[PDB]
């Protein structure tokens, strides 16, 4: 099931490190959560709609910010329709869209935006190769 993917392939130990993502999830592109980590933020429906709209119209959240469970992430450079990236002080967020899914990764210090992006894009790219 999808819970296995979050636990074993998102919340895994990051390479050459003891760290791991603060939380993670896998959503459908329709915005229904398929699986999430125990400490995944209590997101609101309109926050997910905004993320869905950002993959349809890139750069829409850039001036105003990306919100998750009330927490604002300063939007940073991302791949249009594919990856959304955000900064919240020390922490951040990486959202990777595939054919049928959206893979969320949320990190904290000392995890880099590149390492969250590695975990999230690696899994996203596997699900793309498997035809999803």
């Amino acid at each position: 099931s999808w819970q296995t993917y979050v636990d074993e392939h998102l919340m895994c130990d990051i390479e050459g490190t003891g760290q791991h993502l603060a939380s993670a999830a896998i959503f459908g592109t329709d915005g229904n959560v398929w699986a999430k980590s125990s400490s995944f933020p209590e997101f609101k429906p309109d926050e997910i709609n905004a993320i869905i709209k950002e993959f349809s119209e890139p750069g829409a959240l850039a001036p105003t910010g990306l919100f998750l469970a009330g927490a604002k992430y300063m939007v940073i450079q991302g791949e249009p329709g594919a990856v959304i990236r955000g900064k919240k002080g020390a922490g951040g967020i990486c959202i990777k869209k595939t054919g049928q899914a959206m893979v969320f990764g949320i990190y904290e210090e000392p995890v880099n935006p590149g390492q969250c992006n590695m975990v999230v894009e690696r899994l996203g790219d596997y699900l793309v190769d498997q035809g999803m």
Binding site: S1, W2, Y5, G28, N32, L127, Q130
Partner: peptide, 10 residues
């Protein structure tokens, strides 16, 4: 519904 996940990667 969520579609079935593919086989776990190596």
């Amino acid at each position: 519904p969520p579609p079935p996940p593919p086989p776990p990667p190596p």
